[PDB]
Amino acid sequence: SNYIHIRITTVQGVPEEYDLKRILKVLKKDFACNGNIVKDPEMGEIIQLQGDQRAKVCEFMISQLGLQKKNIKIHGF
Amino acid sequence: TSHCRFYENKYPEIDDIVMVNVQQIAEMGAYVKLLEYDNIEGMILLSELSRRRIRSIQKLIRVGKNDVAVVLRVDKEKGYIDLSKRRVSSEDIIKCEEKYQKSKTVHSILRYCAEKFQIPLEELYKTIAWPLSRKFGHAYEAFKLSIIDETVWEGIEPPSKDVLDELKNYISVKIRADVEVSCFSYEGIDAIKDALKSAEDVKVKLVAAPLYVLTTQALDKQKGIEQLESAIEKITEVITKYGGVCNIT
Amino acid sequence: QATINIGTIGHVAHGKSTVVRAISGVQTVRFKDELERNITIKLGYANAKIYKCQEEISPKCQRPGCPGRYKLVRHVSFVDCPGHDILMSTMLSGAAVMDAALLLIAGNESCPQPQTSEHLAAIEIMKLKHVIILQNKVDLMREESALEHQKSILKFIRGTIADGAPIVPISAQLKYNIDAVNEFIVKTIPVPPRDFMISPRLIVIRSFDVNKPGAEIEDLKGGVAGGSILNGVFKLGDEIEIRPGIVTIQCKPIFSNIVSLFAEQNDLKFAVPGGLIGVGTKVDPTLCRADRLVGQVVGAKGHLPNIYTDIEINYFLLRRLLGVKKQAKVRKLEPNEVLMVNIGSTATGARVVAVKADMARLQLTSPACTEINEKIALSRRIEKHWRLIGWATIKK
RNA sequence: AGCGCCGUGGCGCAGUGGAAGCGCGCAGGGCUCAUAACCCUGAUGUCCUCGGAUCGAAACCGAGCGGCGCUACCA
Ligand SMILES: Nc1nc2c(ncn2[C@@H]2O[C@H](COP(=O)(O)OP(=O)(O)CP(=O)(O)O)[C@@H](O)[C@H]2O)c(=O)[nH]1
Ligand SMILES: [Mg+2]
Ligand SMILES: [Zn+2]
Missing domain, CATH: 1.10.150.190 (Translation initiation factor 2; subunit 1; domain 2)
Incomplete structure (x- = not known):
């Protein structure tokens, strides 16, 4: 499990090993985009940032906790 | 023939709460039938329609559904219903x-x-x-x-x-209860068999070695609780003497 | 039933469960939803068939080509023991249980595999010397690589306690050259003297909780446990006592009566010792639910096992540490250090009160029973988990 | 191997007991000079199958079906 995907952009599937508000704090400044933590009931926790920066989202997910980079399959869309 | 209103009289009372079915919208608001009272049309005005501001109307009324509202004034002479959607308590x-x-x-x-x-x-x-x-x-x-x-x-x-x-x-209605066997005695299975034979002759089944789950098909919601506590106390009485201990939480 | 106990040891990610499956045919469950892929916790079990054709998996032989079938010769049990660093106490329990040994050595990996050598030392600790070296990987080697590995195994194992170790090629997938394994097991490994002379005892190594869920509780089975007998035959209709018992820190004995004795396929009234047997008694299944009946010394009524807390032990340590590819010298014991002292099968870390160069006094938190010798193993806390340092024996 | 959930429109829910359910979606159109936003209409199906009661049923139940949580391998 623990699958993660990015859909035009929301990130569905996020490990809980670090606090969410600091993730938002680093995200907004390193992307320069509006950031939302939307907690829909019992779906993959929603973190939404504007623009088409999936390469930059890759950079962020590498720089936050990511060390696998193999279960990430971003849908183009 | 879906007719013959649910309650005592055909004509709704004053300040009474209903749920209504929508059929059409002419220009002002919507005079729509009611499935809480007799099928006489009740009319909603746009001033009393949407808690949010009026910019889209087809998404908040959703013609052909059931919506909570409250009737303000009733005309029992020849049949007009003034019906209001906003001033309804969240409870x-x-x-x-x-x-x-x-x-x-x-x-x-x-x-x-x-x-x-x-x-x-x-x-x-x-x-x-x-x-x-x-x-x-x-x-x-x-x-x-x-x-x-x-x-x-x-x-x-x-x-x-x-x-x-x-x-x-x-x-x-089925009521659940859990009994955990904390026995350190030597022969404690026979006591369980005897106590459950006495209790069952409503439905008690097994999950784990100490865990016994009773799902009683009660008919009064209070008889089940008392039979549950009777079975629990029977378990305790049978088990505290032969050498073991059991607990129920 | 089973006549002699046999076990298999190997390094991690080496392959022994499927090897025994190709030897015996009984699936290793490897349950609890996390043991399926990393390591196991409870012991694996299997049963082998030995009908030898003297002109095999089945009592009737058709594969050799001649319609002659095989006759009953031996039926040996197999106790799969996990060779990993995390768990050692159950490894030592099974090691005291087993009488015959099968060691695995991996070719392309590092020829000294730390767990293989560590468990070979454990084998040599508890009076096990009839060991057959098995090359667990054969297809994955060249001929020259196989020759190099043969010479490496020979040069590495020359002067150890286990000197006469025949070598056998096996795999987990092919299922061939298997009759050689049975032949060498029958030849090199005899059944130790086990008859009616010595008084009966039992050693229980596992706990089975038998309570069929969903079924009506009015008819349920009691508590069944896996046990090994180093002396005497157990018969139905006897009163038995689980001597390490229950905690009321202090412990007090458990008494019960035998209900059934599952013997390798069914419930047999008598059972020659030397094999794992399923003793099903009136004991409470909760006492058999968790890892409770793991390493408990059990007595037939008419004997009085003695419960001890202070134990005087003759112990000896080897020169170097075991189980590491850095290594350090063996250091002499220091007072006030909790050291695990496994009395054949028990799992209780004792405190050291008296220190001598070849003698010691140790206090167990949980008291344990002592009957005659009950050989022991000694492990310390050095490499962030339990590391073998030597062997121990009760002397009082 | 048991009991409790899921039972798809590409999707999560939604009522389950009057028969095609919401938003997310995607296509087109509207808005504006133009875009985003905003405003409309759409095509998506065996809410897995078997029956029962049922004028009426995907629903209410029941006797099998594909996956999930525990018991914990329950000799
Ligand atoms: N090709 C090949 N693969 C093997 C062989 N032996 C084991 N394996 C591999 O080992 C893996 C699991 O085997 P298994 O025997 O169940 O593991 P294990 O021996 O219990 C691990 P541990 O010894 O630490 O307890 C399989 O994926 C299998 O491919 C072998 O001889 N040949
Ligand atoms: Mg196993
Ligand atoms: Zn394969």
Whole structure:
């Protein structure tokens, strides 16, 4: 499990090993985009940032906790 | 014929809460039928329509559905209903939902007879509704008491018993409890078998070695609790003497 | 039933469960939803068939080509023991249980595999010397690589306690050259003297909780446990006591009566010792639910096992540490250090009160029973988990 | 191997007991000079199958079906 995907952009599937508000704090400044933590009931926790920066989202997910980079399959869309 | 209003009289009372069905919108608001009271049209005005500001109208009314609202004024002379959607308490919305569902169940129940025996639905419902709604509460509790012990249908004579027999034919709660065995005795399985033989002769089953889960099919919601505590105390009495200890939480 | 106990040891990610499956045929469950892929916790079990054809998996032989079938010769049990660093106490329990050994050595990996050598030392600790070296990987080697590995195994194992170790090629997938394994097991490994002379005892190594869920409780089975007998035959209709018992820190004995004795396929009234047997008694299944009946010394009524807390032990340590590819010298014991002292099968870390160069006094938190010898193993806390340092024996 | 959930429109829910359910979606159109936003209409199906009661059923139940949580491998 623990699958993660990015859909035009929301990130569905996020490990809980670090606090969410600091993730938002680093995200907004390193992307320069509006950031939302939307907690829909019992779906993959929603973190939404504007623009088409999936390469930059890759950079962020590498720089936050990511060390696998193999279960990430971003849908183009 | 879906007719013959659920409650005592055809014409709604004052300041009463309803749920309504939408059919059309001319230009001002919508005069739409009601499935909480008699099917006389009740009209909603746009001033009393949307808690949010009026910019889209087809998404908040959703023509052809059920919506909670409250009737302000009623015209019982020739039939006009002034109906309001906004001033409804967030806790009374649940009241409207449950009352509408209860009336829907009553409508569903007293249609089977009218269609099986092709007699007037209005006549049969008029005969049945005197002990039904006005006794001390809704019909569903009376119907459940009657299926467990028939006493409500006999309050007044129906047109016949074949229709009531069809009702009974169509109509024809589990409580959980956990018991954890903390036994350190040598022979403690025989005590469990004996106690469960005594208790079962309602449904007690197994999950784990110390865990015994009883799911009693109670009929009164309070008889099940007392049988549950009786079984628990029987377990404790049997098990605290032969050498072991058990606990229930 | 089973006549002699046999076990298999190997390094991690080496392959022994499927090897025994190709030897015996009984699936290793490897349950609890996390043991399926990393390591196991409870012991694996299997049963082998030995009908030897003297002109095999089945009592009737058709594969050799001649319609002659095989006759009953031996039926040996197999106790799969996990060779990993995390768990050692159950490894030592099974090691005291087993009588015959099968060691795995991996070719292309590092020829000294630390767990293989560590468990070979454990084998040599508890009077096990009939060991057959098995090359667990054969297809994955060249001929020259196989020759190099043969010479490496020979040069590495020359002067150890286990000197006469025949070598056998096996795999987990092919299922061939298997009759050689059975032949060498029958030949090199005899059944140790086990007859009616010595008084009966039992050693229980596992706990089975038998309570069929969903079924009506009015008819349930009691508590069944896996046990090994180093002396005497157990018969139905006897009163038995689980001596390490229950905690009321202090412990007190458990008494019970035998209900059934599952013997390798069914319930047999008598059972010659030397094999794992399922003793099903009136004991409470909760006492058999968790890892409770793991390493408990059990007595037939008519004997009085002695419960001890202070134990005087003759112990000896080897020169170097075991189980590491850095290594350090063996250091002499220091007072007030909790050291695990496994009395054949028990799992209880004792405190050291008296220190001598070849003698010691140790106090167990949980008291344990002592009957005659009950050989022991000694493990310390050095490499962030339990590391073998030597062997121990009760002397009082 | 048991009991409790899921039972798809590409999707999560939604009522389950009057028959095609919401938003997310995607296509087109509207808005504006133009875009985003905003405003409309759409095509998506066996809410897995078997029955029963049922004028009426995907629903209410029941006797099998594909996956999930525990018991914990329950000799
Ligand atoms: N090709 C090949 N693969 C093997 C062989 N032996 C084991 N394996 C591999 O080992 C893996 C699991 O085997 P298994 O015996 O169940 O593991 P294990 O021996 O219990 C691990 P541990 O010894 O630490 O307890 C399989 O994926 C298998 O491919 C072998 O001889 N040949
Ligand atoms: Mg196993
Ligand atoms: Zn394969």
